[PDB]
Write a new protein. Structure first.
Ligand SMILES: [Mg+2]
Ligand SMILES: [Mg+2]
Ligand SMILES: [Mg+2]
Lengths: 683, 43
RNA sequence: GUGGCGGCGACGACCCAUUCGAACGUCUGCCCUAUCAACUUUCGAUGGUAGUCGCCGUGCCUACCAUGGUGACCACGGGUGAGGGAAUCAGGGUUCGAUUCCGGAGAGGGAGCCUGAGAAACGGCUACCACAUCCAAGGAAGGAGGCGCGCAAAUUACCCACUCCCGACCCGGGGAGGUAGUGACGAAAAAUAACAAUACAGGACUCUUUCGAGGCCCUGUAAUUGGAAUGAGUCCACUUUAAAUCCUUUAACGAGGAUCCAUUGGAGGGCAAGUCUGGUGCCAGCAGCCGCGGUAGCUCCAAUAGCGUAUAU
């Protein structure tokens, strides 16, 4: 039968990924993308030799096929290759909302069916589970998504948007595909879209790493010095071994007070290092060991690697160490109590974080997920005993800063080499840059401008900021680095709120710009305001319910979502200056969108080789843009002594303090207002 | 698989994507940005 | 005229009778065992009154009463290849005949429950016990035989055309029922040829312990010759049947080396510039597709589509 050649670039990309242990990205376009997954899955099986690949399918609301053996039979009640693929392959189906369940386990291939519902939280969680040479497949089935791709490639400045929400994140997702090394766009047929500009030069690699070479050297050199050697043999990556030696070095010290900090983000082995460190302490003379976590169910891999460290070096399952399980329905299968009696009597006990008592006789206490415990509780667990602290990346930094200032010995070790795949993966680097989940290690110092006198607020344009232009990318990185470095918790979803959520505005405080200056001014403070009321959020609803005030709710006002100042410049008064400039702007004291494409004109647009249309400016002066009239200003924050003094000085008056504290931080939410109705609420 | 190539057994817009002279990266490189509503184009 | 009278059917219906039965009784009659002689009242054994339940009569059951009942005329107890029988019809060259009738019980294991004229259901359900399957881990659904002999296909296929059965029905349905496969344990019948002619030779054949005695209307020749017959096989068409196969008919091809070539067991003959062994110079035993060079289908006997060997007897 007539058969079509498939371009070797698809096979070349897959084979190189398996050999390099690096993942690759595929973007199928068209409503027949499901059949494309079948072909792409089979080619992956030919290259991979370890096992039959596992498939992870993620969808938002509707799945076309039944995925039930009996049900899909009666719906059919001649032969379709897609039906064979579903029944034969081992597919795990998960929802966009229910993505937390698939956090731990690992899959060979990940399929993201629905493009329009993509969120930063979904992307980080699903891509992480892909291992080695696996494929990440993203589909564009809707006709709306296809023409959005069409408008951008025809002209980079022009963009298509129907009618509400702009959805700049999807457009930013499209533009960033060119930068990725391992990205291949294909159609319903096996045809490559030539847009990445690197697809043309793709070639097969000719038929082992510097970090892996060092680990093998350590695994041979540490046979001389042991039982530290046995735990390193259990280790998989080099940076895990270095942390293990650091832990045991702290254990052997003849000092009451010593702290080793394990600073490892997601994807790099963190509980495994803690598990082997506990086994090393058990290998030594340590008897009383305590393990602390917010939940017993949270720590399951830690006790596993304790058992692996135990199993490697004698410690039989019953003759030496005996384990007592949870024996409860809630928080089941957690091993709270571990008892080993080979060397005199030694015991490992899990306790609740709010157990400063029962720690009277402790030699080693291990704190894991330390950021997730309220800050005052961490101090009580310090004590005069050895402490192992592990905190994931992506204040706790203030505590370790105090430890550097001190008495208690400090050791800082960090993990940078991923367990699942090889370092240097193109997909991971592209993913982090798209979500801005990385911060520059060193920030250059700049001169300090006069504080309350010579700084003017500016209006950042949302459309210009998120365009993928190199200058705009650096400015967005500078803003986001300051945006998450505040006391407020950082979440990857906040970038979507900056990009998509309406009625949100960004203002930045700048030094006085000289007439001749560089490409980007330094940013001192960044402030975000969300307009509410007549112009439905925390401030209007909570006041209306609590004070049963009828006239309120017809008033127009905005709340300050976030306020930030640079850490080097903190405490000297840019924060107060920005708020004063807002009040003059909204009171009216200051004297007062990129080209959209019509629905029928999407096809009519031709190629524009050199962009011509003028783009909206990145920063606008406050005088240029007209201002909305706001009756009041508000803020909602976890009540702290430092922030309370700041807001009172600016004129904000409390109206509400939440009864129950937040579980993670142990802080009560507080609402403050500034403008005679305020007099009634305050009384 | 024959060790050389692969043998396997709206649309008008898809045809337009295939016949694209300028890649989106070269489209992106030629692009410029302006700051403060009047400045030298940084791009 | 919100007149009055009417035919032939279908369906349902109280009761009586009838048909098909079903269920309790009466009488008659069972194998071995006495080294089972007494048994029953060991949760009623016999009988009386009243009652419950049941379709009805009744120790069937329950209360209150009497002390009864069976037994050498064998009670009671224990046994008993209780696949095998029992019958039936039909028949000249002895019958390789044919068919029918059952003692119950169960549906993963013991209880409880639902319908109907008829079931304590060949079928639902609930609780307990035992198994096992799917999952997004939350929950959900369930009730037999083959090989172990170098050896696993009927564990199937076609049809309601016959016989009969169920249904609202002349027509639908029936794995009830009918049709179709291999096969030197064995039994029976039968081919692989028959008929003539010519030519050339001179010797058959029986008896006989090497001499011999009888004897001929023929014998032999891997000789030649001739034109009649036929089936093994190949291959049309009817008939058959629900459809087809099979049997019975039948068109055309199908024999001289008729090579279109019968076997198994037993006993003999023939041999070189060949090999080995032992000697009684030239011999004997065993044996001989093998040699100097060369590589392009002898005879006789017994049984006969059948015939040997080993062990035990
Ligand atoms: Mg025979
Ligand atoms: Mg003659
Ligand atoms: Mg002849």
């Amino acid at each position: 039968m007539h058969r079509k050649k498939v371009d070797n670039r698809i096979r070349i990309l897959i084979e190189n990924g398996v050999a390099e242990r690096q993942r690759s990205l595929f973007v199928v376009v068209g409503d027949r993308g499901k059949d494309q997954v079948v072909i792409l899955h089979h080619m992956l099986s030919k290259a991979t030799v370890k096992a039959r690949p596992s498939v992870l399918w993620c969808y938002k609301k509707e799945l076309g096929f039944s995925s039930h053996r009996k049900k899909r039979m009666r719906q059919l009640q001649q032969d379709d290759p897609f039906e064979l693929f579903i029944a034969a392959t081992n597919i795990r189906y998960c929802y966009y909302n229910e993505t937390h369940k698939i956090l731990g386990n690992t899959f060979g291939m990940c399929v993201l069916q629905d493009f329009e519902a993509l969120t930063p939280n979904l992307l980080a969680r699903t891509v992480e589970t892909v291992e080695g040479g696996g494929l990440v497949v993203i589909l564009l089935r809707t006709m709306n998504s296809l023409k959005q791709l069409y408008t951008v490639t025809m002209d980079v400045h022009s963009r298509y948007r129907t009618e509400d929400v702009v959805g700049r994140f999807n457009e930013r997702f499209i533009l960033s595909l060119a930068s990725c090394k391992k990205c291949l766009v294909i159609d319903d047929q096996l045809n490559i879209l030539p847009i990445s500009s690197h697809v043309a030069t793709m070639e097969a690699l000719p038929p082992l790493g510097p970090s892996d070479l060092e680990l093998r050297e350590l695994k041979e050199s540490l046979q001389d010095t042991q039982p530290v050697g046995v735990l390193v043999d259990c280790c998989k990556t080099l940076d895990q071994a270095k942390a293990v030696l650091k832990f045991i070095e702290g254990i052997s010290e003849k000092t009451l007070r010593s702290t080793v900090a394990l600073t490892a983000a997601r994807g790099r082995g963190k509980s495994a290092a803690l598990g082997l460190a506990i086994a090393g302490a058990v290998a030594f003379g340590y008897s009383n060991i305590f393990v602390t976590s917010p939940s017993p169910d949270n720590l399951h891999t830690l006790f596993e690697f304790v058992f692996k460290g135990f199993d490697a070096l004698q410690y039989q399952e019953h003759l030496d160490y005996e384990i007592i399980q949870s024996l409860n329905p809630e928080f089941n299968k957690a091993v709270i109590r571990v008892n080993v009696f080979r060397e005199h009597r030694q015991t490992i006990q899990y306790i609740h974080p709010a157990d400063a008592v029962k720690l009277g006789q402790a030699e080693l206490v291990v704190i894991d997920e330390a950021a997730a415990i309220p800050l005052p509780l961490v101090k009580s667990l310090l004590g005069p005993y050895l402490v192992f602290m592990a905190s994931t990346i992506n204040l706790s930094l203030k505590l370790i800063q105090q430890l550097r200032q001190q008495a208690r010995t400090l050791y800082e070790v960090s993990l940078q080499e991923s367990i699942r795949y090889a370092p240097g993966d193109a997909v991971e680097k592209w993913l982090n840059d798209l979500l801005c989940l990385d911060c520059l290690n060193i920030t250059r110092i700049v001169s300090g401008c006069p504080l309350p006198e010579a700084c003017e607020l500016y209006y950042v344009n949302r459309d210009t900021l998120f365009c993928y232009h190199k200058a705009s990318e650096v400015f967005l990185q500078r803003l986001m680095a300051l945006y998450v470095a505040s006391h407020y918790k950082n979440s990857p979803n906040d970038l979507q709120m900056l990009s998509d959520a309406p009625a949100h505005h960004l203002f930045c405080l700048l030094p006085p710009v000289p007439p001749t200056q560089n490409a980007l001014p330094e940013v001192l403070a960044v402030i975000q305001v969300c307009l509410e009321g007549e112009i439905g959020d925390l401030i209007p609803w909570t006041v209306s319910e609590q004070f049963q005030d009828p006239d309120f709710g017809g008033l127009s006002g905005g709340r300050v979502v976030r306020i930030a100042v640079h850490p080097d410049y903190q405490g000297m008064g840019y924060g107060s200056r920005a708020l004063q400039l807002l009040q003059m702007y909204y009171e009216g004291r200051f004297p007062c969108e990129i080209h959209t494409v019509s629905s029928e004109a999407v096809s009519l647009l031709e190629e524009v080789i050199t962009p011509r249309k003028d783009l909206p400016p990145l920063l606008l002066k406050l005088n240029e843009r007209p201002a909305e009239r706001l009756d009041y200003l508000g803020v909602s924050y976890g009540l702290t002594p430092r922030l309370l003094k700041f807001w009172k000085r600016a004129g904000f008056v409390p109206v509400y303090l939440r009864q129950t504290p937040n579980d993670l931080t142990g802080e009560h939410s507080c609402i403050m207002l500034k403008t005679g109705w305020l007099a009634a609420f305050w009384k | 698989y024959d060790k050389d190539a692969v043998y396997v057994d709206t649309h008008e817009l898809v045809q337009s994507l295939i016949s694209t002279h300028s890649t989106i990266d070269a489209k992106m490189a030629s692009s410029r940005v302006t700051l403060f509503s009047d400045s030298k184009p940084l791009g």
